[PDB]
Design a binder for this molecule. Structure first.
Ligand code: HEM
Ligand code: HEM
Ligand SMILES: CC(C)SCCC(=N)NCCC[C@H](N)C(=O)O
Ligand SMILES: CC(C)SCCC(=N)NCCC[C@H](N)C(=O)O
Ligand SMILES: C[C@H](O)[C@H](O)[C@H]1CNc2nc(N)[nH]c(=O)c2N1
Ligand SMILES: C[C@H](O)[C@H](O)[C@H]1CNc2nc(N)[nH]c(=O)c2N1
Ligand SMILES: [Zn+2]
Lengths: 407, 411
């Protein structure tokens, strides 16, 4: 029932009780651990609503008050009558912040209570969606002083009138298959790029082309819009010691904005809920630049550094990796665009875990995602035991719309 | 039922059926995953089923399932259990069992090598001096003057739990740690408590930064006895860097033979509480963990000082820079002295090939991602991108409590 987690570097032990409140399932069983797998009615809704309102009223220290009991009755009445219900602004803000608080894969949660929530439930068209999104982008970017934000579109109804952003992130680069057999741009986005073309986008067919938005309102066919270029803050990548680095022609965008997830609050489903914070440097320099299935630039960089690439044991990949990551952080810092390094980010997360343990009784965390993709054991999270479990409100994965949409 | 795992770099999808043979539990439930938790006498009643599954497995491995020889062995084991409360493994079954415990070790990246294990049968051992002799022979054989060979030595199994064979050392070869009155540590901080025990047992400590610890050996539930491994049997490597000439003056060395001595081997219900085993190092074990953990030798600052990196801000990645240089040094030093070592790129690439071959031939390969992914440069190794299923197969290696916590002192 009560569970201990130990830090093997500091010997600090913490007791988790919060997991007992957990509801959804992990994918694991007593016989098999699925810890490293990427993706493991009216009757249904009222318990979900109650569970949520109970935690909301508890949080404002008004549990079992007249105002508490009155809202539960009102929501039950609305469900019985409409088969759904509407959240108060206060409940929406609370729910969104707590979905982030509960995000077991997010290292940046120390920030969870400073989220600017943009209520877009009055939106009816793709043009309106585009307007809301440009405003989100400009607010969050803040000329490089980035601010966390989420924009929340109308909830699911009968399931044939879904709002969706087809893009995986608001800002991403195009990918094109070449007659060469190679890939131009970002190979992760080839399929989405093709969907854009088949829908009518004229592509510049370059290495770093900001994709258009493909927005779906009210279960209608999705529509294309180019984000005003002046709202997309980008960063040229240079190195503080290697003058040749700029010749590689690398750039990245300042605003990481996940747009393909589903926000669940009190049983209600927000299928369009783009949200954004700011980058941890490794996301760009380790993953986006060095994954073999991504920009895969390790080979080119190592060559310019004149390292011995004859044998893996020279650690040439490891040397180049570090340099690429130094350059990303240096470039963002020099252009005054918010970025956090993996040492600072994991250090703050340890402090956050301890806050959550004493103030809340625990913190769900997925070690496989929390530990940075480079220099794992020299960050304090490596040595920290974590318990992973699913609390609601939550951000969830959902299938890509092109597999699902009825045209 | 079939379970699928995907590699997100290659899109290669594999199907696991082997998990259906898993009996032991994980620590996880449908409501909690304990995937990152480090540590999450039998009755005749429980013993014969365990013996039976094992012998059915052994007899299938040799293509003799249901044979007269298989059936006669079952009956023989059965009768021996009801008569004596336990049983003895044939040499062939012992070898198969020890190899399979390695094959089944989900935290081990080196498993491509599982079928090449030299098994030394030490079940006729009776005394601590006997144990010492067996362990010296293991060390000499495994070391092989730098050309390391995997080996395990197997002492007599548990009987009533009052007559246990134990090696009190956590590894056969490790360096002493000494806590000083000013709170600093001399040597390896991981071994402070064990060093304190050795000293109290009468070990005369040299008190340097790399003093090889004595063996503390318990035979037959008796109080443990101290022994010094002959220095000439302990192969060591001075650490230097290919381009940095000041690196040698750090005064660093490490031993060549990594030999875990504190685990328990379970085969067919039988418990071998002293079963030291050894392979060879992956460089990051020494360069990342042993040298750079804050709770170990903690050399990152001193190395980064000497390199003249910008140390005032973590975002210069000074720690990451120093980390790579140290790890280059460890591999360079071992290679130069012709002592077996494997880099983390080579080892992970070989593990993926092993894992795929195991899916094809065995129907699965239990693997613990948290342990398999190296402690530096995670995502530039292929294992990071590989989904894995963790489950527990027998024969297996298991943790057991440290013996100073459980031993009944005789005096
Ligand atoms: C403010 C600074 C933030 C930092 C430094 C940060 C850090 C990170 C990192 C490094 C990841 C792993 C991403 C990957 O590997 O693809 C992540 C994932 C995630 N973050 Fe955060 N984050 C921040 C803000 C936010 C916000 C504002 C939200 C929601 C309101 C959020 C929710 C999530 C979720 C749900 C995931 C998992 C996404 C997935 O499974 O792909 N984060 N975060
Ligand atoms: C042949 C070369 C081998 C290599 C390169 C290798 C590599 C490794 C590494 C890097 C680890 C993680 C160690 C740590 O972080 O402390 C490990 C763990 C382990 N290995 Fe291997 N290994 C080898 C041979 C063996 C052998 C011969 C056995 C037994 C017969 C074995 C069984 C295990 C077990 C049980 C663990 C988990 C240890 C624990 O939980 O503390 N390995 N191996
Ligand atoms: C938006 C939430 C998921 S986390 C806040 C932003 C962020 N730090 N990253 C988002 C993921 C970006 C991706 N890894 C990339 O490298 O492009
Ligand atoms: C003996 C099995 C567990 S694996 C075969 C040897 C090995 N490669 N490592 C053993 C652990 C060494 C420890 N990490 C150290 O850094 O001293
Ligand atoms: C197979 C494995 O689960 C997968 O590669 C994971 C590992 N850890 C990760 N960690 C983060 N933060 N982001 C990721 O995309 C991944 N990928
Ligand atoms: C808490 C966490 O599980 C612990 O630090 C683990 C992480 N992964 C590891 N992986 C290996 N190979 N060896 C280790 O000691 C550890 N330590
Ligand atoms: Zn699990």
């Amino acid at each position: 029932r009560f569970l201990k987690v130990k830090n093997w570097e500091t010997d600090v032990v913490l007791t988790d009780t919060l997991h007992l409140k957990s509801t959804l399932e992990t994918g694991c069983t007593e016989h098999i651990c699925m810890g490293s797998i990427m993706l493991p009615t009216k009757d249904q809704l009222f318990p979900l609503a109650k569970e949520f309102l109970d935690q909301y009223y508890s949080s404002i220290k008004r549990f079992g008050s007249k105002a508490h009991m009155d809202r539960l009755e009102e929501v039950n009445k609305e469900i019985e009558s409409t088969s759904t219900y509407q959240l108060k602004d206060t409940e929406l803000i609370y729910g969104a912040k707590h979905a982030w608080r509960n995000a077991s894969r997010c290292v940046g949660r120390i920030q969870w209570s400073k989220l600017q929530v943009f209520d877009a439930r009055d939106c009816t068209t793709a043009h309106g969606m585009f307007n809301y999104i440009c405003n989100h982008v400009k607010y969050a970017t803040n000329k490089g002083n980035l601010r966390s934000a989420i924009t929340i579109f109308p909830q699911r109804t009968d399931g044939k009138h879904d709002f969706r952003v087809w893009n995986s992130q608001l800002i991403r680069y195009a990918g094109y298959k070449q007659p060469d057999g190679s890939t131009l741009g970002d190979p992760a986005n080839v399929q989405f790029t093709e969907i854009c073309i088949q829908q009518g986008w004229k592509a510049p067919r370059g290495r770093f082309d900001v994709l258009p938005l493909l927005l779906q309102a009210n279960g209608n066919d999705p529509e294309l819009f180019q984000i005003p270029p002046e709202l997309v803050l980008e960063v040229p990548i240079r190195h503080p010691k290697f003058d040749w680095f700029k010749d590689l022609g690398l750039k990245w965008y300042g605003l990481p904005a996940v747009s393909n997830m589903l926000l669940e609050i009190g049983g209600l489903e927000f299928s369009a809920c783009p949200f954004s914070g700011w980058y941890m440097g490794t996301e760009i320099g380790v993953r986006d630049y060095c994954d073999n299935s991504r920009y895969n630039i390790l080979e080119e960089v190592a060559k310019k550094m004149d390292l011995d690439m004859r044998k893996t044991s020279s650690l040439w990949k490891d040397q180049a990796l570090v340099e690429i990551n130094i350059a990303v952080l240096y470039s963002f810092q020099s252009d005054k665009v918010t970025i956090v390094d993996h040492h600072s980010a994991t250090e703050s997360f340890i402090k956050h875990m301890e806050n959550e343990y004493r103030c809340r009784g625990g913190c769900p965390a997925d070690w496989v995602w929390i530990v940075p993709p480079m220099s794992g054991s020299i960050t304090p999270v490596f040595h920290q035991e974590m318990l992973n479990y699913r609390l609601t409100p939550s951000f969830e994965y959902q299938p890509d719309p092109w597999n699902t949409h009825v045209w």
